[PDB]
């Protein structure tokens, strides 16, 4: 045998090494052919749905979801004990190749990596095809295919069309180095941006309390008041909450909602080249303000789905929705206005006029938290190559990288009906940021329900089916702001 | 000195469903008190709704002008219909402004008044950046949307430039 | 330390996150420190 089975976790100091081994099976895609694909192949009635590209016989390996590398215990042992983590070194191995014919033994499997990032990088878009979360499962390698420039369903002049080690006693391996990225924050701030003040002491700044003397004619006056503990809304502040792009509030109670379709028509979107795209998930904003937990922003969350759920028009219970409540300290709520500006000059003949900022780009002083990562969620994304970017961290969450983990392309060398089964052991190393807090009282952290139940969460049922009961998020620990 | 072979929104793999879901149907239809929240996979067949990591770059809308003198309005709007900034009570035309696609693809006759390979990562100069919900849709009133004419910077924006004074701060100092 | 390879996550200790008049293991408005509940040590699980 050309390799062994490695699954484990090694908790060492400030580092954690995770190793996952899975058995996989790779068929032939496109009958060893490359083929053009487009929207017209489906009929492509919507311009917003218009696309063009090619399907390839190649497969690829997507480990980009966290649940591949962390058992539910390890994710618990992690999130409760640490303020942050981030990958350092990647290591990948493809061993124990077996080739079949249709079933009898035989051939080579071609496999290679793109180190210079020349081929289209499709991993960071959160597609299915990930390694299975439960080590006993066997994951069929998903087909590779890509998209490029288009006009309607037709291609255009600039559109583009796109060496491998050959292998049954052979193996394939490489090592990969994560570039420096900041720790993905996993904590909730104890203080809210506007509560930073010392409640016991006055400010030396002033605010304007009275613009008139009383009731009557010709009452205009200027009266000022010390910004102080009794009135905390008016005090001067050095920093302001992060950017916002409003989402339509949706009531998770069916009755509260409007009795008409509003999915697309009332959705936020951004416009590119005449094609409108839903703004998803969008900038990081707290889902709901304290006191209402049942609402969620429309596309402002990552909506996963439960086991046995799939495809079209599933019920509400089926899909599981992530929660962004913790970032409510530094960030504006997703379905609420940023604030107010004045729309005019007050005259003696005209009252002041205000308006609701729906969206605000960056201003000096804006601080924010990025979107939390989930055990079921993606890990990294690929920063596009452009002239300039701002805060490259990806909008679904995770670590933005200009040079993220390379793709691993794979296909069978060709006909005879043929498929290849094999093994994969992938190893990522993570750096840990320890919890230094001096907080006196015990803090909220993940726990299983001790009460009796039919089944164990994160365990297989009587038919062997494995399921992950709820989205789990990193930020449980608390820092001072 | 180059152009992209991929649009910002098509970076997806066409052959694979995401594991992400969206809100497919607010209303069951044709009846009073008939509202149901159905969810659906984001996938290849519907490419507008999928979750995406990066959004196109900033915009400050330009007025539109066409080469054919008939398509244009029968009035002089050169100064009145111009996008400007106001500094010390003096109004200055915005020229050329930030980098934006000069026209939508397929339409070569229209050009920005003070303004095409950046079209993939950048909003067209004439077109609004997007929509924003302007209220809460809760039975009494249906959901509404506004039009965003200009959009500042947001985490996850990527953009192209066009093909430094002594100050406390500057962002993307590359000359306009 | 614990080398446990158990797959499903443990019972831990938590501070219930819900709006409350006071915080547990903190001081009330007169500064009287309070321990609201006894805390045992046994949460993590072992094999027999």
């Amino acid at each position, epitope marked *: 045998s050309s390799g062994n089975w490695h699954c484990d976790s090694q908790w060492l100091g400030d580092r954690v090494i995770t190793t996952s081994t899975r058995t996989w099976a790779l068929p032939t895609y496109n009958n060893h052919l490359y083929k053009q694909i487009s929207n017209s192949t489906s009929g492509g009635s919507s311009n917003d749905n218009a696309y063009f590209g090619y399907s390839t016989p190649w497969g690829y390996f997507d480990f980009n979801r966290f649940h591949c590398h962390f058992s539910p215990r390890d994710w618990q042992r992690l999130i409760n004990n640490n303020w942050g983590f981030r990958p350092k070194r990647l290591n990948f191995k493809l061993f124990n190749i077996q080739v079949k014919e249709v079933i009898a033994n035989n051939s080579t499997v071609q496999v290679f990596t793109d180190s210079d990032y020349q081929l289209p990088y499709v991993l960071g878009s959160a597609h299915e095809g990930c390694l299975p979360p439960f080590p006993a499962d066997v994951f069929m390698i998903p087909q590779y295919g890509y998209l490029t420039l288009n006009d309607g369903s037709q291609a255009v002049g600039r559109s583009s069309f796109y060496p491998s080690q050959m292998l049954t006693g052979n193996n394939f391996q490489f090592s990969y180095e994560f570039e420096n990225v900041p720790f993905h924050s996993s904590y909730a701030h104890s203080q809210s941006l506007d509560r930073l003040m010392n409640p016991l002491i006055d400010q030396y700044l002033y605010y304007l309390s009275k613009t008139i003397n009383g009731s009557g004619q010709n009452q205009q006056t200027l009266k000022f008041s010390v910004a102080g503990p009794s009135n905390m809304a008016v005090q001067g502040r050095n920093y302001i909450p992060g950017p916002s792009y409003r989402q339509q509030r949706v009531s*998770t*109670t*069916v*009755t509260q909602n409007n009795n008409s379709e509003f999915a697309w028509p009332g959705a936020s979107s951004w416009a590119l080249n005449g094609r409108n795209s839903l703004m998803n998930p969008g900038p990081a904003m707290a889902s709901h303000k304290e006191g209402e*937990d*049942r609402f*969620f922003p429309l596309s402002g969350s990552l909506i996963f789905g439960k086991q046995g759920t799939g495809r079209d028009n599933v*019920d*509400a*219970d089926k*899909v*599981m*929705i*992530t*929660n962004e409540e913790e970032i409510k300290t530094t960030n504006p709520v997703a379905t609420e206005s940023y604030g107010q500006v004045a729309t005019n000059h007050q005259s003696a003949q005209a009252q002041a006029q205000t308006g609701w900022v729906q969206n605000q780009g960056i201003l000096p002083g804006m601080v924010w938290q990025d979107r939390d990562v989930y055990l079921q969620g993606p890990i990294w994304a690929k920063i596009p190559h452009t002239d300039g970017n701002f805060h490259p961290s990806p909008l679904m969450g995770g670590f933005g990288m200009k040079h993220p983990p390379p793709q691993i392309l794979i296909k069978n060398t060709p006909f005879i009906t043929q498929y290849s089964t094999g093994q994969v052991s992938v190893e990522i190393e993570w750096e840990l940021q320890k919890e230094n807090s001096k907080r006196w009282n015990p803090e909220i952290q993940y726990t299983s*329900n001790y*009460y*009796k*139940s039919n089944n164990v969460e994160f365990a297989v049922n009587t038919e062997g089916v494995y399921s992950e009961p*709820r989205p789990i998020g990193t930020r449980y620990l608390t820092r001072n702001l | 000195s180059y152009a992209h072979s991929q649009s910002l929104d098509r970076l997806m793999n066409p052959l694979i469903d995401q594991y992400l879901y969206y809100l497919s149907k607010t209303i*069951n239809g044709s*009846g*009073q*008190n*008939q*509202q*149901t*929240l159905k969810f659906s996979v984001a996938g290849p067949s519907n490419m507008a709704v999928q979750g995406r990591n990066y959004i196109p770059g900033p915009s400050y809308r330009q007025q539109r002008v066409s080469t054919t003198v008939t398509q244009n309005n029968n009035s002089e709007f050169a100064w009145p219909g111009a996008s400007s900034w106001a500094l010390n009570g003096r109004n200055s035309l915005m020229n050329p402004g930030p980098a934006m696609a000069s026209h939508k693809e397929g339409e070569d006759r229209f050009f920005p008044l003070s303004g095409e390979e950046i079209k993939t990562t950048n909003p067209v100069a004439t077109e609004s950046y997007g929509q924003v919900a302007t209220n809460h849709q809760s039975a009494q009133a249906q959901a509404q949307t506004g039009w965003v004419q200009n959009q500042g910077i947001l985490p996850g924006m990527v953009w192209q430039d066009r093909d430094i004074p002594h100050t406390d701060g500057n962002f993307h100092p590359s000359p306009l | 330390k614990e080398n446990s390879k158990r797959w499903n996550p443990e019972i831990q200790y938590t501070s*219930n*996150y*819900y709006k*409350s*008049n006071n915080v547990e293991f903190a001081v009330n408005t007169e500064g009287v420190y309070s321990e609201p509940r006894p805390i045992g040590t046994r949460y993590l699980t072992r094999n027999l």
Partner: antibody
Amino acid sequence: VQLVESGGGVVQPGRSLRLSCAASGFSFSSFVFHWVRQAPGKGLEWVAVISYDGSNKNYADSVKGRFTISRDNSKNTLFLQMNSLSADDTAVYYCARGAICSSTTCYLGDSYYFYGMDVWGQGTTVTVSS
Amino acid sequence: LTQPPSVSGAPGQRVTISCTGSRSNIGAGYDVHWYQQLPGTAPKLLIYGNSNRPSGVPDRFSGSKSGTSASLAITGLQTDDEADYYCQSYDSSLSGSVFGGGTKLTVLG
């Protein structure tokens, strides 16, 4: 919006009678339904809870296995058929529709926790006596 | 989930009803929904959620949640407010909801 009941009668101990709830004026599919039983002098007792499309049903302890629940979506009807009635079951039965959710778990949106029953039915008296 | 067998108050006053609860019941943070029924009539949801009054409900009817025990404070007692109140909450161990033991408010006028 209306929720009714039917099927009540005089059972006598030991025999079964189906208990059906027909409902119109609201989408049948988008709401989760409950049955709640009330003895004459005793507080409301929650008999059963069935999710939308009827995929998952979790009975109360007392009635477990001696009741069943069937929800037919097409005719907008809720059917609770019971079995092996004793004289402890003599009481009204209210057809309920769950909507409101215990706050923190609303995002998971399970079949259970929708114990909020905004509106519910007229009830029917099922009397088990010899 | 246990309620007082009887509560009694005079018109024009402040009446309070409180249902103490177990860890399996209210420790989890599960919302506590209050119901009222005029006698011999179908019960009506009163305070959906921890403290919210739905459309078509009097402002005076207000209730809250603290610790394991929710409370409901009616202000400006009216004759129409004499009826049975019921505290429900989900119980984790049971895995099904548990209503309270029932209460009859007595308007003393």
